[PDB]
């Protein structure tokens, strides 16, 4: 459908108690896959939501990022598109842009999220490793930062 609907769902999630919604994650993912030429708008809207969201909501924003990045990656494989040489207006472009904001969103969640949410981000690294979503060097950096943040 569109970016206006996507931003409207993010607005509703911002006002929710937990920021975690399986139904909203699926709706947001469909809107981004139905509008791939506008992937810069959808990726930028997730970045803006994650950064402004309450501290309790950073994990839910990472679940949105997770679903969207893996869906662009699936689309790219289907269309024989490379992550190393992405088509900006197509699935590989979206996969590349979502990768570009991942470090910032994980770092922001490390700084603000309740400590209980931090092992849940380690679980995303495992999902990404299994799906080969991000290069191992990126995943090692994220894992190291999360392990450091979990204190002891």
Residue numbers in the entry: 2 to 153
Article sentences:
Seb1 has two ordered domains, a CID at the N-terminus and an RRM-containing RNA-binding region closer to the C-terminus. In contrast to this widely accepted paradigm, we demonstrate that the fission yeast CID-RRM protein Seb1 drives transcription termination of both types of Pol II transcribed genes. Using a multidisciplinary approach, our study demonstrates that conserved CID-RRM proteins play a key role in 3′ end formation of Pol II transcripts. We present high-resolution structures of the CID and RRM domain of Seb1.
Thus, we crystallized the Seb1-CID1–152 and compared the structure with other CID structures in complex with CTD peptides to determine whether interacting aa are topologically conserved. The highest affinity was observed to S2P, followed by S5P, S7P and unphosphorylated peptide. Also, several aa make phosphate-independent contacts with the CTD. Most notably, a Tyr (Y64 in Seb1) forms an aromatic (π–π) interaction with Y1 of the CTD in all published CTD-CID structures (Y62 in Fig. 2e and Y67 in Fig. 2f) and a conserved Asp was shown to be important for Nrd1 function. When these two residues are mutated to Ala, binding to S2P-CTD can still be observed (lanes 7 and 9) suggesting that both aa may contribute to the S2P interaction. Y64 and D67 were predicted to be involved in phosphorylation-independent interactions and to therefore affect binding to all types of CTD. Indeed, Y64K reduces binding to all phosphorylated and unphosphorylated peptides; however, it has a stronger effect on S2P than S5P interaction (lane 4 and Fig. 2g–i). Despite Seb1 having its highest affinity to S2P-CTD, this demonstrates that disrupting interactions with S2P-CTD alone is not sufficient to observe the full phenotype, and that interactions with S5P-CTD are also required for proper functioning of Seb1.
